[PDB]
Amino acid sequence: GTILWDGRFNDMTSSADLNKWSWGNQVGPYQYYIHGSSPVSAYVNLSPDYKNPADTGSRQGAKITLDNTAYWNGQNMRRTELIPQTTAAINQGKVYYHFSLMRKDINAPATTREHQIAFFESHFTELKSGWLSGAPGISDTLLRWCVGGQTQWSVEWAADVWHNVAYEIDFAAGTVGFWHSTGSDPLTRKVAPVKTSTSSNGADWHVGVLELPRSGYPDSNEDFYWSGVYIESGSLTTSVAGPGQPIP
Template sequence: MKFHILSGLVAQVLSVSAGTIIWDGRFNDFTSSADLNKWSWGNQVGPYQYYIHGSSAVSAYVNLSPSYKNPADAGSKQGAKITLDNTAYWNGQNMRRTELIPQTTAAINKGKVYYHFSLMRKDVNAPATTREHQIAFFESHFTELKSGWLSGAPGISDTLLRWCVGGQTKWSVEWEADVWHNVAYEIDFTANTVGFWHSTGSAPLTRKVAPVSASTSSNGADWHVGVLELPRSGYPDSDEDYYWSGVYIETGDITTSVAGPGLAPVDPPASSSVVPVPSSTRAPVSSTTLATSTTKAQSSTTSSAAPVSTTPSGCTASQWSQCDGNNFTGCKSCAAPYTCKYINDWYSQCV
């Protein structure tokens, strides 16, 4: 009996020991989502930049509650429900989107780091399976989750949740309701690789995909915690809710416990009942160029030592891609027949 107790404690310690949080987005310091309104370009406070959303009040797009978090996530006081509704169009675009971006000067784009979050959906206001959704993505889309029908793919709908690198599916699973998917992107910005860790419920994270080569491009202010939905003619909007928990970035050894660094799981680890879909049965990944989103590099008013980079030579941006803006270092020429349209000082887009 003592042996079993000791073994359990050892296993718990091994699953909890981990690295150091360098950015914490777990909403623990928020009274409500209205706290997101304290951030602005002139008052860059709090853990998140909040500017990619529709025209309604913040509560139309982001809401917080203890009932929205993964019950096994002991490190979070509450989770977030991020919503797309019929007003969730930003800056006149035809893509619905609600996204939060880390507000930090931490080196979240240097060396090897782990981007953690948990994601869940319900049957009520479920994400449409007939449209492509880009979830927890970077500006260059070098890695992201996707759900729904991929733009340009055959068929009408797709029920998978996918992890993609450079637009190519590396892992997928049926996205069932009320199942928490715990994720960590293992990103090595020095080696230009990205790996994938995953579990469900309260089970510890395990590596599902070993690091693969990727164009790990990030200025440290372009990871989007939320969702961008690509438009599709003939399919009307419906409200969609995405539940988030345990959002943080760490360096050092990965935290495999869903509870968070230094904490014991609330529930005993349970094996996942969700089975990844073999690659032979997956729907083809579209070769259509993915729409990108806006970013905002760190303001010169907050950092006088911002890294300097040059625009890639000879490159062109595709339709919907960003093509200019303050501190933007990507492709500034649009592929024919598209032109670079000014949206605001921080963002222009190929249309």
């Protein structure tokens, strides 16, 4: 394996380091600009308590928050997103996109609203949660993996459960496969590569969350926990602790 880009925050002391990035000085591992009017500590906070405990490859996890001010560029959807800052060829050939996600019951994401998570700008693949369409119902509490907007896999999204994911993307063939595990277990392929328009410039993977509005549902704080975010090529690391760490 080979890590093309590391988004595990290991060289950051706190989320304040995200402020070092700017269009005129694109330093660090993440572009930080898709957020609301408040300071970064309103939206992103790092702590060892916010990561998958089995992931010894990540020192701290990030709590990503949507609050009443999480609106970017005058849009009506709430968003707090980080984009990889890299020169690596993360959008060519076969690449694996990793991330671990967890929600708690406190400030839990609203099941009445659609959330788009860890999505590419064209939305060719992403996770989704909440009430998407039709009548409200049992499916609204599901965490789903979508390709071209169509759900290909889903699972009940329980509190305190860490979901480890790797999108297996072949940008040459235009296919995306899904690797997943919960907790400390190794990633296994749960959906063979699915065909879709995989078009990306490499500066368009949104690590974070977008939540659509829904009539009659006011904003309340929503917290999402993330760890183990990185991109690798040539060989998938199935260990949730990442490359170079002992396998749990």
